Every structure is written in structure tokens, then in C-alpha cells.
Amino acid sequence: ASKRALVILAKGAEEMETVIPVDVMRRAGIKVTVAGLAGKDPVQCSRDVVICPDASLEDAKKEGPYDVVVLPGGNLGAQNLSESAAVKEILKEQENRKGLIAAICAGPTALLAHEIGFGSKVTTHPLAKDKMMNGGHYTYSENRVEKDGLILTSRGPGTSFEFALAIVEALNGKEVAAQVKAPLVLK
């Protein structure tokens, strides 16, 4: 059976961090749902790219659970994710069922806000480190991608391919990730 990914898309999301994982996971045969935090309407990303979500988060949640829940970064996107009671519920449920949670750039700060995965080794964008580390509830890493069990984090737009391929490897295995990677012309 095909794996299923939920990508939570908030106003101010970093569009590169949103699109690269969506595209790469689709390349891997994953069924991806781009879910609008605010509802069904188009979303103005951080650099003004406008993306039309597949569904509202409200609707997508009804089709859960998912093999991965993906949180893009962007400071303002991550803040909106961190402030959301709906996101809290989704992540809590995912963690409780031992499902993968993947977050990039400022995205991992929503894990802090929602008390997810405390004790995990994590990375973030360098500028989000102090926020993520407030309280010392995680151990910090400078690895471009960090996978500690079912908490998978990464650093920025420039680590988005690596992040996406790590998700693919976690869900579909090393060989599928390598097959997906080759046509992309990555260094």
C-alpha cells in the first residue's frame, strides 16, 4: 500500500521548503496531501508565492492518520503552526501512534510549542536554534538532516532535498530514495 504524507501549509510558510518535499515525495509514489491550515483557500507563502492546497487541514485530518506529518519552515509559517490547536492535536496523535514527524528550518519550533518529542536530537535553521533550545528540552545538532527515531528535522531551504529524500528513505527505503534522487541532478 502506498504511503501517505500530510504537509501542513500555513500563511508565511517557506515555499521552497513546502514544494521540494511535496514534489520529491510524489516522485517517490507517496500520496501527498497539501493541507491548508486556515481552510481551503490559496496560501501566501513567505516570498509571496501563492499555493492552492489540496484540502483544508480540517478535511485532511478526517482522512488520517498519515505515515508522515511534514512541517515546512518560514518564521511566520512556523509561528502559525505553533499557535494552532489543530496542529497540536495532529502531532500528539502522530507521536502517540509512533508515526513519523518531519520538520525543517523554523518548523521544528512547532514541536517545542506542542511539546513533541522532548529528549530528541534535533536541528533547525541556525537562527531558530535559541528558540528551539529554550528550556533544554532537546539536544542540538548541526547535521544538515537529523533523524532521531520518529523525529526528523533539517536546517533550511538548502537542505530541503536532503530532508525530502530522508523522508522518502524512512517511508519507502534506501533504494527508492536513490532511484528518486538520480534524475534530480543533485551534487
Ligand X SMILES: *[C@@]1(=O)C(=O)[N]C2=[C][C]=C(F)[C]=C21
The verdict on whether 45 is a catalytic residue reads: no
Between CA 157 and CA 168 the distance in angstroms is 17
The verdict on whether 105 is a catalytic residue reads: yes
The C-alpha cell at 139 is: 539536544
Instruction: Pick the catalytic residue from 52, 114, 125, 137.
Output: 125
The minimum distance between CB 115 and ligand X, in angstroms, equals: 20
The minimum distance between CB 165 and a second copy, in angstroms, equals: 10
The minimum distance between CB 68 and a second copy, in angstroms, equals: 17
- Contact call for residue 52 and ligand X (CB under 6 A): no
Q: At what angle do helices 174-181 and 160-172 cross, to 10 degrees?
A: 140
Q: Which residues bind Cl ion (CB under 5 A)?
A: 46, 74-75
Residues 95-124 contacting ligand X, CB under 6 A: 105-106
Stretch that binds a second copy, among 76-84, 93-101, 125-133, 169-177 (CB under 8 A): 125-133
Closest CA to 14 of 108, 89, 149: 108
Cβ atoms within 10 Å, residue 22: 22
DSSP 136: S
Active site residues: 105, 125
